């Protein structure tokens, strides 16, 4: 299976690696209808989203979306640095596919 965030990312269309190497500056969570999402931003100006479960998502991803929204809330609260993100850049804001952190 992929051994790295970068191998994994490269198995997909419309993705791009961001090297962040920093903590989440802000965290936004919405429970508004049809907008049940998390939006995070970094000091450098980038904004990324975990997107709403739609039709572009297979069933196995429904749980993985929830897990990612959990990871993003706890790495914001503990101020853990994110190393890299693999994002779908055909979305605005770009959509998170995988996350890496290391110390």
């Amino acid at each position: 299976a992929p051994q790295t965030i970068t191998e994994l990312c490269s198995e997909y269309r419309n993705t791009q690696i961001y090297t962040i190497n920093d903590k989440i500056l802000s965290y936004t969570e919405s429970m508004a209808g049809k907008r049940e999402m998390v939006i995070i931003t970094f000091k450098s100006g980038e904004t990324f989203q975990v997107e709403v479960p739609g039709s572009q998502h297979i069933d196995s991803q429904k749980k993985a979306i929830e897990r990612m929204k959990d990871t993003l809330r706890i790495t914001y609260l503990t101020e853990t640095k994110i190393d890299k993100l693999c994002v779908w850049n055909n979305k605005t804001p770009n959509s998170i596919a995988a996350i890496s952190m290391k110390n």
Binding site: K62, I74, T78, E79
Partner: protein
């Protein structure tokens, strides 16, 4: 008078309550247990 004194106390308590929140974000986060929302609902 007190206002000088009361302002150093108020400002020093603010900077402390703020650092204390940083420490609680570290040590209390260890107890956070994530929920399987889909089977919960």
């Amino acid at each position: 008078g007190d206002t000088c004194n009361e302002e150093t106390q108020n400002l020093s308590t603010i900077y402390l309550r703020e650092y204390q929140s940083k420490v609680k974000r570290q040590i209390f986060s260890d107890y956070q247990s994530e929920v399987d929302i889909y089977n919960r609902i």
